[PDB]
């Protein structure tokens, strides 16, 4: 829950099912 996290499309983002 961090607003300063990357708002763009990211290949290195979490590819899991994290809800």
């Amino acid at each position, epitope marked *: 829950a961090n607003p*300063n996290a990357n708002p763009n499309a990211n290949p290195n983002a979490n590819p899991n099912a994290n809800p």
Partner: antibody
Amino acid sequence: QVQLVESGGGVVQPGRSLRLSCAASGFTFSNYGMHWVRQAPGKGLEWVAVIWYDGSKKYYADSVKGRFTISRDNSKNTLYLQMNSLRAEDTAVYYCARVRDSSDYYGDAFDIWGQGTMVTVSS
Amino acid sequence: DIQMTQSPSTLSASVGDRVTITCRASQSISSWLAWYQQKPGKAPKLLIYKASNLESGVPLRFSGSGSGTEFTLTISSLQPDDFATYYCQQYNNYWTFGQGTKVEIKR
């Protein structure tokens, strides 16, 4: 030629509502998170809201939270900003800015800005 | 809420001078700092991102230094196109801007 074009600004009275739209072109609008930044007449820069690349996350400044609503249409390359219960202090020019692209965990600076749109709130 | 404080507020200089603008943060922001240039009526323009990196297409005479709470925008040799207002911005805890430094022509 990557550009951002704000529009929809005008003169409104207190309590009334207005809708701003910012049309993107030249790049892939669906891959970028967007911001709204306003600048009151003769003053500095103030942040309004941010939306994620897929609209899954939205954050607002405390000065507009509950009153403003950010949104986007990735099929028409358009960012929106719904301004409800407008106040006199909301009078400013409203810019839409693009977050610079990085593969890192954190967001970057605003690397592309629009020409702005003037919103005037006065009875 | 992080507050950014620029100094000076106004600055007179002639073409060819070395110009140094400082920007102070109310708390540590690591290197999450940006520098913008704005001319009257026009939009802001990204100059420096992440404290020191030069934005592509921005002339090399623009440098940025600093980390933590004290930062510096330096124009190594002022040019006639550089007379404008410069803003610093932190993007570590939400997004806040400084009040700006106006680079004026000296006579």
